[PDB]
Structures are given as structure tokens and as C-alpha cells.
A = this chain, B = another copy of it.
Amino acid sequence: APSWIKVKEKLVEATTAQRYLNRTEVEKICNDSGITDPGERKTLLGYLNNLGIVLYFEALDLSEIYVLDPHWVTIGVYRIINSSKTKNGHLNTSALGYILNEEKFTYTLLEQRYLLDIMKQFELCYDEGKGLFIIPSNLPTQIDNEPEITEGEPLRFIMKYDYLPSTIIPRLMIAMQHQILDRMQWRYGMVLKSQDHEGALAKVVAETKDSTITIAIQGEPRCKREYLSIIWYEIKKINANFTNLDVKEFIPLPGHPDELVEYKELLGLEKMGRDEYVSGKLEKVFSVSKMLDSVISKE
């Protein structure tokens, strides 16, 4: 691929000379080297984006910042997530200039906006409201006001990962920003309150050592079921982005908080017309329907 090889060199050189390039500079660079048909242009650039060589965001697509130097965005992003001002997981964007230029690369006002946009795109942060961004992976491991949410025989539902990406909790906070109660959010979890199921209050917690995300829910019985339904829907969407996750869902056996049963086991047992779940390990028998009903109505 004689044309592709050249453009690579030319674009890498041009990206490290300037900080980034615009459509015109780029189009000319590949038309100089031969490549004209816009499909080819697009397939080459996306390709180099993947190979980490040169950065290209089809989601933003700004002419003046079309193709970026990777080193420039990494130092920028690094400086943001490593600032002393973001250590507790909060970012007052007023401080972006101080963070990026104070604490030899320069970042103008627009170049700051652009970095934030890349960060949003990679789901590393979100806007909470009053010019205050939250960076979930910088949130403290504990909070002083963390509620128990253990009080009223709550509904527990356990998600077991073969391997658990450290970005599931961040991504879930982004998904449900408007339902996080009183900044009740930490590195490993949230407190979520719903409006539409007047009542329903949920706590979602990740356990690194066990590769589990655990959902616990309080409120009226119909509410608890409906809110788990939505939280789990949100987590299913997040999980879908990872190629090789193996996630099994679990319910605690009644009276045995440490003994779990696979949720798809019980559906299976039902589909085949069994009402008994038999536990050899416990030498106890459990009702299939009663346990299914605690989580989901008759479908």
C-alpha cells in the first residue's frame, strides 16, 4: 500500500509539528499522495485511530480539529485526571486553564472545550449542573454519609462477572446522573432514587475482589421490582459494549444470604414445569415461583 504508507508518515509528522490538523490540510495530504475517494479517506483514518497511531473522532468531526496527535490529548487528559483539583472526583471547569497550563504543551480555551468533549465521549466524566463536572473514577473509596439500605428486607440482585471492568460504575453514574441522591456516589457505587416509582430507593455497589455488582432496593413491592428492572436494563446496555464479558445474574436463596441461585436457572425450571428448586449443598427445597415473583411478575 504505497499511498497509505506515505500518508501515515506525512500525517504523523504533521500532527507532531502542529498539535492537530484541519480537513483542508488533511484532504490535501492524502490527495497529494493519491487517495481521493472519500470512502478510502475515511477507512484509512479510522484505521489509524484504532492502531493508536493518530487520533480521529468521527463523533465530533470539527474541521479545525479534525485529526489529532495522540501524545497531545493524552498529556492533556492525564493532567486533568491527575490534577490536585480533581482528586475527590470534582472538576470546576473554571480551573481547566490552571490545570492544563499551570500545575511544553499549551491548551487554548477551545482546546480545553475539545478535551472535555473527548473525555465525555470516552465516558470519563459528566456535567452535574452548575459548571461542575464529576469524574467518577476519581471519587473517594468511601463516603461518611453512605446509607445502609439494608433495613426492610430489601430486594437483592447479584451480577457476577467473569472479569469486571473498572468502568462499569462510572458508566452507570453517567447513565443515571439525574437519579443519584445527595452526591451519594463513591468509586464503587451509588445511591439511586426514582421519581416515577414514588418511593423506590436503590444502592448499587461493585466488589472488586468478587467481580460482582450488587443491586439492593427498598420500597413498596411493585416499585422494588420495577426499579430493579430499569437499573438492570441500564447495566445491560453498558455491559453490551464489552466484547468478552460473561455475566451471570443471581438471586439470594431465602434464609441463606450467602447461597445464590442463578436467575436463568429458575426461568429454565419454570419453562420445564418444575416448582421446586432443590439445593443439595443445603439439603433444602425452595419454591421456584415464589422466588421468581420477588423479582419479576408473571410473564
Contacts and interface: CB of A to CB of B under 8 A. Distances in A.
Interface string A215-241: 000000000001001100100110011
Interface in A23-66: 60-64
Interface in A73-114: 93-94, 109-110, 113
Interface in A188-212: 195-196
A230 B196 contact: no
Interface size class of A (residues with CB under 8 A): 20 to 34
B237 A94 contact: no
Contacts of A71: none
A237 B117 CA distance: 11
Interface in A115-143: 127, 129-131
Contact of A63 (B61, B94, B240): B240
A178 interface: yes
A242 to B, nearest CB: 11
A293 to B, nearest CB: 15
Nearest to A236: B62
Given A195-B93, A195-B131, A233 B110 contact: yes
Contact of A61 (B127, B178, B195, B237): B237
Interface in A157-193: 177-178
Given A63-B240, A129-B178, A240-B63, A109 B229 contact: yes
A230 B109 CA distance: 9
A196 B94 contact: yes
A89 to B, nearest CB: 18
A195 B130 contact: yes
Contact of A131 (B113, B196, B233): B196
B63 A233 contact: no
Contacts of A229: 109-110
A71 to B, nearest CB: 23
A216 B172 CA distance: 37
Contacts of A93: 195-196
Contacts of A61: 237, 240-241
Nearest to A94: B196
9 contacts: A60-B237, A62-B240, A93-B195, A109-B229, A109-B230, A110-B229, A113-B233, A129-B178, A130-B178
Nearest 6 pairs between A and B by C-beta?
A131-B195, A129-B178, A61-B240, A94-B196, A127-B178, A93-B196
Given A94-B195, A109-B229, 9 more contacts: A60-B237, A61-B237, A62-B233, A63-B236, A63-B240, A94-B196, A129-B177, A130-B178, A130-B195
